[PDB]
């Protein structure tokens, strides 16, 4: 009795840069009573969580937020790389209440307009949190979908408790045909993990596309305190960074230089990327009676191994889920922790 | 794939397979081995058409004998369905084999949907278009044109180009579906109708509606070249008997009788003027009568036959003169007496029904006109008109109506039954007496084909029970098998919503009327479904008047406003054209964003042939259970015949018919196994019928889902929709219910050869 | 729909956006009204804002519900201008030409606000929607009745304009009866059929308005063993564990640490002349955007003359700020002038470096 992914078969490519434009759904449907406060409040709360998470794991991307009220798509946060703006925008929205019908077509068109400036190496995306069971379009939709797939704009949507044919067509269409991206939910926890899996970059099997070197430079922190002075918000700020080339102060960020317009990063962002590129082989669960290995943990020192012949208890299993390449044991907690938070396998590091 | 049936290469066009399809192939081949009928209920959830055509094509192209295949789908809609699917099969077969095709297979419907002549086809009523094409290209107007080059005679000229090139040869090589046929024959400016009609002598496999098989008035040109031995397939055969009956019944209304009076007067004028001009030809035709039935030009008619032969195809016809009727004026007088007797018998006070023999004797009493002369009236009138070469038929439509009536009532006996209803009680006490005439025994119309052909099939996704048909149609079978939907998942949720929120038994049985409890209950049901299901929903009211009243007074309430707020409404209306338009907009909306509701009638045209795929149908309904006896006693009379002739009681037959139509409605909402969809019902009486349903429906209908209230219904369907939405694709449980490419069938059942 | 030159030339749109933000109009004018920048390039920086605004604008709402609803979901507020009054009426107009025409014709006289809509209730909301009123309130008068008569045949001709030759899968027409010439029976009471045709017609009109598309080793082990022994050799006198040993060494360690504590403490994680502070802030924003345009252009490249104009302007700005510092030192004295110089040091350095870099590149190109 195990619930594990068999194997990862695109551990070669992902979209590391991103520009994901999450589009919420604020329309009369979202006011029904299936999720604890409503659909809407729970949705926005989880949206905040996802914003934090996504801007953590992909700390070099941008993001924009879009609502769908009264059949209109009203941008509530410009495509920007500072999580706090989007966070505040969502805060503001959550106190406002939905109305009108969701105009999927308008939101789609607004996005396609929005992502034009994003350069070729950056990758586009949208994430429709579609909640209702209808749309209300002021135009042909398949027209838009065709324009989309022409502009190389992958789309993933998370329907609420139903399946809508057009959305299924939409996901199947933009994502190079390979349909896996219209996942819809059946529980709140399912919803949390839905957003979580939306956080990561997105491979399926990438067509051979243009791969391009991108100019960027790293800043150096500043020293003085009273000389507070800023060139990205025109304030007094007690000390920040210096563009190596533009050579002007910039308040703390991985932002783009507001003088000479080149990307700024430290490295730790690149480190996050590295973590996403080449993950580990999924740790194997050791055979119950065939292990005969050390009775402890390895990374930690846990005493949860077996019980040695106990009718049904020992017949159950032997908590020895052990990674492959280092071939050392690890208790369940250690394996969960390694594969979730820190991806340097303890033993596999040491040799 | 290319597997074997122990002798037969099978070029099944798909990599996958289905298990039930494989059983279907095995059993249908087993049937074709040994001459039988062997009705077979294969759920429409699979592809019955692909299995049928693949196996039969392979059989015909592998053995050397059964060179021809006849496929009778119920309506031209399913005709072109079979055609397009067959075309795809053929392309696959060539692709896998190269070119070993030499194959032609053609659809065959009618002029109205085929005549390409612009002005001609601009006409609406099919009869008129038929007449126009007849005149424009007849054996006579051509002579008028050629001998007398003049503006009087024109021509489609499509018939002419056919005469030039097509009747030496055939269309290139394709199994032309009507889209392809129309495009091509428009390019090469041909007349598709005559093309296929003449082509019948060469098509390897033919597809045509039931009427062309059973309606004797058009099932005349059956040229035993067509089969003489062929393998014959009835797809969607659950509505056979009613097709037979409707092919043999007949209506009469005093107004048409007066029309016939006018036509007879016009006939007197025509005969007067022509005999003033030319009568020697009329005497020549008298001689051609006195020699015999004039088959030399009453039958050897490339374009002539005017009044069809409503009697069975010439079996029940004599060949001598109609005695005194040889005189045209005599014949007109005969029809005069006939129509007047019909009028006076029509003025009868109240309902009266008689055997044809009884009515015949009564007429003899009032006017001693004998049966034998009477029978010949049809061809007599027709060839007389040909001798008259009239310029129009509209004046003679009532005349041919009366000719048909005379021929029928003078030919058959002890199976039919007259009835003279003086009015329509729905607007009772008004002048509208109808001389309704109908058959009772469905077997009469079929009997000739079961006599002619040897190996026949019966197939539908709905037939049940599989014994009523041997009873009614009186035919011998071999394999009466039903197939079970082996599914690795639920895939659809039959329910029986007997009690609304008020926990009150509901139906349409009470009346055809209002009872605001029932109305509000149904409206609540409909609107909550409209809230819950995604795009695409259907309903099936039991009868049209029912829908009219119900929706009218739904609009009375605000109920329709809510469903408007969610989805689209697309009603079903009697005119076919507007119906088609509405239906296509329904499809266009379903595949678009906005959900759309189409509400139609179970007995109606919509359920007959239209299909409802994944998107286009999620949650059918059955508001009430369809029953007929709302109207008058023709069903009562037929049921009387049923009870006396077959050991079947009234309510048994009525329930059987109702569940027949219910299953036919329900089966439409699935196409493959990837599809899915709720299939609710709604009435108290449904709960006890759970066994009448076809097997594969019954399996999914567990016991616990009976007489559910609307509320638990909504709960369950919500859970369903969510669960099915999941990508539950283990793909290893699908090795159980898909029998993957070339192997799992091979392995599994080559071992199961036990 | 949105193009770089299009937004560049969308002068009315640009001025609308000027009205959009006080900060925007301020920076723009001080880049313009101060004899500074042509608006063209100024927007050439700000293009995404323009695109966003434009899209946020021309956003036609759907037809659909509200369109319909405007006949169904709108049966209560018999008061004055109800919900979405102008919005609802325009939805009506796009939804039904007849009402728009009647209202227009009844502008010069007979106000369509109260009395127009009152009579409209009866006339239309009986005509459309529910059953034939026929009797009862037949207020459908004058323009109402006229438009009724019109709309009849109008919807007729529309329906006429709707008939496609539907693809022969669905063709119920050719499907029914147009195979044979048969004789059946039929038995399954006027009005309301029109209701059904009404809903069909409404829906189809809606959909069509949407299809329109509008040492190592040895010594290593040796020392190791030595230590191992020493350990094993009792020892480990934690008393002897240094404590601090040399009081001097101890002191030195403390010195190092207090030095570092002081230095890192110097990190205290408020200008005087608020008006001059704001003025200097404006100057910084100005010089920042000016340099922004250069460091765009000086990188990118054939518009050399544009770069020349930018460079001359930037040198002018540098001299301007030099004079600004001179005036600040003159008036505010030194301490305030010192604070200003501190506030402007980074930007000043950046622009000076840009000037020097341009001078170097210009010398390289010339020599
Ligand atoms: S078959 Fe030819 S002549 Fe006859 S109706 Fe069709 S197009 Fe006209
Ligand atoms: Zn700043
Ligand atoms: Zn810079
Ligand atoms: Zn551990
Ligand atoms: Zn390891």
Swiss-Prot record, chain A:
GO cellular component term of the entry, any: nucleotide-excision repair factor 3 complex
Record carries keyword Metal-binding: yes
BP-aspect Gene Ontology terms: nucleotide-excision repair; regulation of transcription by RNA polymerase II; transcription by RNA polymerase II; transcription initiation at RNA polymerase II promoter
Keywords: DNA damage, DNA repair, Metal-binding, Nucleus, Transcription, Transcription regulation, Zinc, Zinc-finger
Gene Ontology molecular function, alphabetical: ubiquitin protein ligase activity; zinc ion binding
Zinc finger residue extent: C4-type: 243-260
Domain annotation VWFA: ranges: 19-198
Cellular location(s): Nucleus
Keyword Nucleus in annotation: yes
Major subcellular site: nucleus
Similarity field: Belongs to the GTF2H2 family.
Function: Component of the general transcription and DNA repair factor IIH (TFIIH) core complex, which is involved in general and transcription-coupled nucleotide excision repair (NER) of damaged DNA and, when complexed to TFIIK, in RNA transcription by RNA polymerase II. In NER, TFIIH acts by opening DNA around the lesion to allow the excision of the damaged oligonucleotide and its replacement by a new DNA fragment. In transcription, TFIIH has an essential role in transcription initiation.
Description of how the protein assembles with itself and partners: Component of the 7-subunit TFIIH core complex composed of XPB/SSL2, XPD/RAD3, SSL1, TFB1, TFB2, TFB4 and TFB5, which is active in NER. The core complex associates with the 3-subunit CTD-kinase module TFIIK composed of CCL1, KIN28 and TFB3 to form the 10-subunit holoenzyme (holo-TFIIH) active in transcription. An additionnal subunit, TFB6, plays a role in the dissociation of the SSL2 helicase from TFIIH after transcription initiation.
Further remarks about this protein from its record: Present with 2340 molecules/cell in log phase SD medium.
The protein's name in its UniProt record: General transcription and DNA repair factor IIH subunit SSL1
Gene name of the encoded protein: SSL1
From Swiss-Prot, chain B:
Outcome after substituting residue 236 to K: In rad3-1; abnormal sensitivity to UV irradiation, defective excision of damaged DNA bases
Outcome, altering residue 236 to Q: Loss of 5'-3' helicase activity of TFIIH, transcription still occurs, has no effect on DNA translocase activity
UniProt GO molecular function: 4 iron, 4 sulfur cluster binding; 5'-3' DNA helicase activity; ATP binding; ATP hydrolysis activity; ATP-dependent activity, acting on DNA; damaged DNA binding; DNA helicase activity; metal ion binding
Entry EC number(s): 5.6.2.3
Recorded catalytic activity of this chain's protein: Couples ATP hydrolysis with the unwinding of duplex DNA at the replication fork by translocating in the 5'-3' direction. This creates two antiparallel DNA single strands (ssDNA). The leading ssDNA polymer is the template for DNA polymerase III holoenzyme which synthesizes a continuous strand; ATP + H2O = ADP + phosphate + H(+)
Gene Ontology CC: one annotated term: nucleus
Positions occupied by motif DEAH box: 235-238
Span of domain Helicase ATP-binding: 7-285
Locations listed in the record: Nucleus
SUPFAM superfamilies (alphabetical): P-loop containing nucleoside triphosphate hydrolases
Cofactor requirements of the protein: [4Fe-4S] cluster; Mg(2+)
Binding residue positions for [4Fe-4S] cluster: 115, 133, 156, 191
UniProt-listed PANTHER family: DNA REPAIR DEAD HELICASE RAD3/XP-D SUBFAMILY MEMBER, GENERAL TRANSCRIPTION AND DNA REPAIR FACTOR IIH HELICASE SUBUNIT XPD
Residues that coordinate or bind ATP: 42-49
Additional free-text comment from the UniProt record: Present with 14400 molecules/cell in log phase SD medium.
Family: Belongs to the helicase family. RAD3/XPD subfamily.
PROSITE patterns: DEAH_ATP_HELICASE, HELICASE_ATP_BIND_2
GO biological process, one term: positive regulation of mitotic recombination
Enzyme class label: isomerase
Cofactor comment text: Binds 1 [4Fe-4S] cluster.
Subunit: Component of the 7-subunit TFIIH core complex composed of XPB/SSL2, XPD/RAD3, SSL1, TFB1, TFB2, TFB4 and TFB5, which is active in NER. The core complex associates with the 3-subunit CTD-kinase module TFIIK composed of CCL1, KIN28 and TFB3 to form the 10-subunit holoenzyme (holo-TFIIH) active in transcription. An additionnal subunit, TFB6, plays a role in the dissociation of the SSL2 helicase from TFIIH after transcription initiation.
Effect of residue 115 to S: Extremely UV-sensitive
From Swiss-Prot, chain C:
Additional observations: Present with 5150 molecules/cell in log phase SD medium.
Gene Ontology CC terms, in alphabetical order: cytosol; nucleotide-excision repair factor 3 complex; nucleus; transcription factor TFIIH core complex; transcription factor TFIIH holo complex
Any one biological process term the GO annotation gives: transcription by RNA polymerase I
Keywords for the protein's UniProt record, in alphabetical order: DNA damage, DNA repair, Nucleus, Phosphoprotein, Repeat, Transcription, Transcription regulation
Keyword presence, Phosphoprotein: yes
GO molecular function, one term: phosphatidylinositol-5-phosphate binding
Protein known as: General transcription and DNA repair factor IIH subunit TFB1
Protein localization: Nucleus
Residues in BSD domain copies: 1-54, 76-128
Keyword Metal-binding attached: no
Known partners and oligomeric status: Component of the 7-subunit TFIIH core complex composed of XPB/SSL2, XPD/RAD3, SSL1, TFB1, TFB2, TFB4 and TFB5, which is active in NER. The core complex associates with the 3-subunit CTD-kinase module TFIIK composed of CCL1, KIN28 and TFB3 to form the 10-subunit holoenzyme (holo-TFIIH) active in transcription. An additionnal subunit, TFB6, plays a role in the dissociation of the SSL2 helicase from TFIIH after transcription initiation. TFB1 interacts with XPC/RAD4. XPC/RAD4 recruits TFIIH to the NER machinery. Interacts with the NER 3'-endonuclease XPG/RAD2.
Purpose of the protein: Component of the general transcription and DNA repair factor IIH (TFIIH) core complex, which is involved in general and transcription-coupled nucleotide excision repair (NER) of damaged DNA and, when complexed to TFIIK, in RNA transcription by RNA polymerase II. In NER, TFIIH acts by opening DNA around the lesion to allow the excision of the damaged oligonucleotide and its replacement by a new DNA fragment. In transcription, TFIIH has an essential role in transcription initiation.
Family membership noted in the UniProt record: Belongs to the TFB1 family.
Recorded superkingdom: Eukaryota
